[PDB]
C-alpha cells in the first residue's frame, strides 16, 4: 500500500492531465451510457410508465430498473413502489449509497418512505433550493423554531443545526406513527449543478464528517442533488475511493475512470461534467496525499 500510493502520486506528478485530456476522458463515459440506450442494456421501463413519468424531475434522467430503489412501506392507498433512486454498490457490498433526485412536491412522502424503509441515518444534500432562477429541490427537512413538518404519517423536526464553514449538519427527528429516529442531514450550499467548488477541501471535510457518524455499510447513506447524478456521482466516487484508501485496499490497477464507469452502470449519468470528473480526480489525488501521511 505505501508503495502503491507513492507510485500513483509520482505518476500524477510526472504527467499532468490537461483539460483536453479530461474532456477526451469524459466523452468516453458519455459514449458508454449512449451505447447503453442503443443496446437496451439497462432498461428504464418502470420509470417510463405513465403512472411514474411525472415523478421524475428530469425527463432524460431515468433510473435503471435492475438497480432502482423499490418502495413497499405503505402509508395510504395511493402509495406506490416507484421513486427516482438507485442503489450504488460500496467497496464491500450492494446498497452502500442511495442516489436520488431532489424531491418534487408529489414525492416528498415517497422520499421519507424510502428513508424510513431502508433505515437511512445519513442524508447528503449536494444542492440548493434555488439555482439559476429555478427550483431544484423541495423542502423535506425541518429547521429550528419550525416544529414538526408533516409528510403523510412522517413528522420531521430539527433539534440542532451545526453550521460549519461550507455546509450545515442538521439533526433531524422523524416520528413515524409511534417510533422516533435521528437522521443527520448534511447540506452543502454554493455548489451548483454543472459548476464546481473550490477547494476540494470542504467536500473532504464533509465526507470526513459523514463517516464519523457512520463508518460502515450497515445501512445505505442517502446522497442527492437536483438530478441525483452529477454532484451525487462526485461524492460517491470520492467516498468509495477514500474507503479503499483507509482500509488499505487500493488496487495496483487503480483508476478513477474505471470506478466512475462502474458507478455509471448503476445510476445513469453519474458525474455529469468533465469539470466534476476533474474534481473527483484532484480530490482522489489529495486523499492519496493524506493517506501517505497516515502511513508516515
Amino acid at each position: 500500500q505505501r508503495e502503491i500510493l507513492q507510485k500513483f502520486l509520482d505518476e500524477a506528478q510526472s504527467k499532468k492531465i490537461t483539460k483536453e485530456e479530461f474532456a477526451n476522458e469524459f466523452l468516453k463515459l458519455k459514449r458508454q451510457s449512449t451505447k447503453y440506450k442503443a443496446d437496451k442494456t439497462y432498461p428504464t421501463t418502470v420509470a417510463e410508465k405513465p403512472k411514474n413519468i411525472k415523478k421524475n424531475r428530469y425527463k432524460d434522467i431515468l433510473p435503471y430498473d435492475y438497480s432502482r430503489v423499490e418502495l413497499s412501506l405503505i402509508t395510504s392507498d395511493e402509495d406506490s413502489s416507484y421513486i427516482n433512486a438507485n442503489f450504488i454498490k460500496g467497496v464491500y457490498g450492494p446498497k452502500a449509497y442511495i442516489a436520488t433526485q431532489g424531491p418534487l412536491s408529489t414525492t416528498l412522502l415517497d422520499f421519507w418512505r424510502m428513508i424510513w424503509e431502508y433505515s437511512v441515518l445519513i442524508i447528503v444534500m449536494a444542492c440548493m433550493e434555488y439555482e439559476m432562477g429555478k427550483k431544484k429541490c423541495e423542502r423535506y427537512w425541518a429547521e429550528p423554531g419550525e416544529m414538526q413538518l408533516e409528510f403523510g404519517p412522517f413528522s420531521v423536526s430539527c433539534e440542532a443545526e451545526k453550521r460549519k464553514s461550507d455546509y450545515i449538519i442538521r439533526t433531524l427527528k422523524v416520528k413515524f406513527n409511534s417510533e422516533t429516529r435521528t437522521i443527520y442531514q448534511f447540506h452543502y450550499k454554493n455548489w451548483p449543478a454543472h459548476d464546481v467548488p473550490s477547494s476540494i477541501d470542504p467536500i473532504l471535510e464533509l465526507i470526513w464528517d459523514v463517516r464519523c457518524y457512520q463508518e460502515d455499510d450497515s445501512v445505505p447513506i442517502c446522497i442527492h442533488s437536483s438530478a441525483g447524478c452529477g454532484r451525487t456521482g462526485v461524492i460517491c466516487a470520492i467516498d468509495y475511493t477514500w474507503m479503499l484508501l483507509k482500509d488499505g485496499i487500493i488496487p495496483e490497477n487503480f483508476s478513477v475512470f474505471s470506478l466512475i464507469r462502474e458507478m455509471r452502470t448503476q445510476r445513469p449519468s453519474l458525474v455529469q461534467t468533465q469539470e466534476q470528473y476533474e474534481l473527483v480526480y484532484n480530490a482522489v489525488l489529495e486523499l492519496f496525499k493524506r493517506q501517505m501521511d497516515v502511513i508516515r
Binding site: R57, K59, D60, H194, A227, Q272, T273
Partner: peptide
C-alpha cells in the same frame, strides 16, 4: 420535457 443530461 424537462432535461438534465447534462451540463
Amino acid at each position: 420535457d424537462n432535461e438534465y443530461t447534462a451540463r
